Amino acid sequence: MTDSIMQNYNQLREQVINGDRRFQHKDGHLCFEGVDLDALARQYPTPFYVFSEPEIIRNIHEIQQAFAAHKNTKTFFASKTCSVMGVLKAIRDAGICAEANSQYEVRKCLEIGFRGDQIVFNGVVKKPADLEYAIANDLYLINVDSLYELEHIDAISRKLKKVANVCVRVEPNVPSATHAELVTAFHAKSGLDLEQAEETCRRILAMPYVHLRGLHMHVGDQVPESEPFAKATKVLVDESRRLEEVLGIKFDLINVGGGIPVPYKYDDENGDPLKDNMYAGITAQDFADAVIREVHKWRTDVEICIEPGRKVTGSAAVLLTEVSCEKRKTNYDLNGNVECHVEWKFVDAGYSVLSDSQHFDWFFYVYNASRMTAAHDAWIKLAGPLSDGGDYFHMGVKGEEFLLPKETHVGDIVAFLDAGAYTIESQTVYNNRPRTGVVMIDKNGDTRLIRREDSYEDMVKYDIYLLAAA
Template sequence: MSIAAQHALPPFLTAKGANLALDGHDLTQMAAAHGSPLFVFSGRQLAGNAKALLAAARAGHPRARIFFASKACSNLHVLQIIRKEGLSIEVNSGGELWKAQAAGFKPAEIVFNGVAKSVAELELAIGLGIQAINVDSAFELSRIAEVATRLGKVATVALRIVPGIGGGATAGIQTGSERSKFGIGQTELTEALDIARSHAGVLDVAGMHLHIGSQVLDLPDFLESVSFTARQAQEIAQHLGKPLRHLNLGGGYPINYVHQRKGANTGRDFDLSAFAAEQPAAGMMEAVARAAARALGPQPEIFFEPGRSMVADCALLLTRVENMKRRGATPWLYLDGGYNLLLDSAAVRWYYHMVNASRMEAPADADFRVVGPLCDSADCFFDVEGEYLWDSLKESLAGIAGVTPELLATLKAKTVRLPETRALPAATAPGDLVALLDTGAYSLEEMFQYCGRQRAKAVMIAEDDSIVTLRDRDRPEDLVDAAERMGMAAAR
């Protein structure tokens, strides 16, 4: 078996002898040069993803546009590469709007999402004349009308509608139903349309927007959202007496976090299907764009808002094994990076594939419990809450008639989201470098300084093979803000 197959590596990761390499660069050498923990991005992969998704969208619909969901990764270097490839941007706050401008995006290349936009944020967006503000409620639409009237401007908006379509790998990232906090429901839509008609002089309802979730694995869910958009957009146009100029189908396109046959790298046969996209995002997007061309016609522009599928597989996190101990027969590894760097590993128990970047010549043949460095029991790369809940549930079900082994297996799969162990080489030990793959999305922006841990450095291997620093590692003094420093000086 090849090393790539043995360790379930994506194509841009290879081995240089015993060491893992990204775009041909030895990652153990990079960790030695830049320290650990360290995020390493591939500029080639990022640019390639941007090209592929834009080409796929336009192959399906000639008037398709892509607005990168910058919440996934709003590092300015990343945004500049995405803009260079001809994409636009979606923002969720005044801060992200500022970063979009700093990266060079023009107002017509920006849409503004968000569930709680402040008056100041709306003033900025309306004043700039951005492509569209995606409106999340009837109240927000009335607030936009007030701000636009005061500024003497016309606000271009799109109504974000709840489609009632489920999608997403976990409940925390499903956004398409009224159980989520997003969008305008059918009852509220009537009120919003009344506001739009009564403020037609300052509100230009140019489009409609929806979003069904993140890491949506099933193409039929996306196709259903197209059918919903066709029906809903026609109704909105009839109420307003004019057609909509754009229809925003959102994002949620998945990547394959697993890279492996079922059961590999887990220490047991564990269901990781929620993290294993079998169809590439570009292929799914092209199919959705083609469906949109048929259902919505050639006139309105079609917008997409991919985030995860643009950047997740562009980066990995290098972490050092700092400690090791045993609990019974099971060895435990303690890494120098935890959920302070990968918040989703705790918040939604997200799976990140692991390899020992310094022992690529050895098979991943031993099971390890893997945890982070924080003084917090939740800082682990297994589902500690789910495991405790399952033990309690299993005890409660013991002896109940009709509880079959098959039912127990189903219940456990619903309760425990992550494998209990990870398969790594048996010789894995303190000093080794472990790589967590596909960490480009929802990582740099979500890092924090719990337990006095400094946020990690991030570098990018550019397309010309130069090394670009995306962000420096926090300094010790960065753990103390300016007000605290002033207080410390006064105390002296």
């Protein structure tokens, strides 16, 4: 079976450079929208991320095509997924809107060109200063998370004499087959209890500068099944319908959140999405079909807002990291007898550069971009440069082991695929390694830097100290 695993992985390798809309090969190198990534990793210092604006556009089209059966849909990119300004601008250019989770996320969306009526503000903590900024900028929605926050919205909206447009976020009591930390609709810190929606909405109606637009929920992240979306949307729809009758109102909209999964493992025939959510399980079309069906049982004219994040960018980046050292190690037992030997390959990216590979057991395809057409036929362990004993990549092809060509040598470029969601803002300067540069491939296939690597002077500029040596 360990040869079949190896055989299967190289079947996947050949699929990347043969039937993948993102990738080709040239001179034995992995290519991304026609850009030789080996050559690219010689022009910029590794490790760095390369994003594909073509692939962002493709993903966005998939999301929008998915909702064709409901004309009045509004799509808000969850900027928490990636808020590099060049990536935000590409998403604005593609024609959808923006969702933000903090005052500075709202500000950067405004700065990059999203209008206030293109921005939704989510979050379990919106301090008075955050609310005042949001209300002064005529945000499309502030998705109210608590009665405490609502009291501030009432007072600040009156103070500003500006209408605050709100959804009431409710927990629909719907679990999902994703990471425990990634469920947000079941025993959650976020949202009001469903039971509190009625009186909350009633009070918003009486508030002169707070305009109730609808109800909000968000199921979770990387949800690999359509049923949670159907169940949760039904809860929201049923309460929306009931409140319309009870309160004598007509809701502008309903906001069903995000959570469309992205494939991080592609050989679906070998995977069970309900046991391993690296298998996506559903497409954007399944998500749309589930949401739209439930909403249409209530109104076909109401506006549906969605908040996809991961799906917009997840598949649209690659992490490029150079093999920087190598060693063979012996593993002994407690009495000093050999157990095995381990071929360690060290790349210049650790978990401070790719957080979820460590902290959320996230799988990304790993290939030798310099030897993309070579058989990946050696079992190796892939370590980062950090001090932590545990800074190596545990989510291997088999156990903690990866497959690379037996010819791999120091200086080869290793590529992590599907590296575009939740990979940039989560970086650290642990061990004072810099956070990575970020390169963008535009619609013409041309590359440019859209974020610099942190410089040394960046490592210290935040500190206040007396310099001792120049």
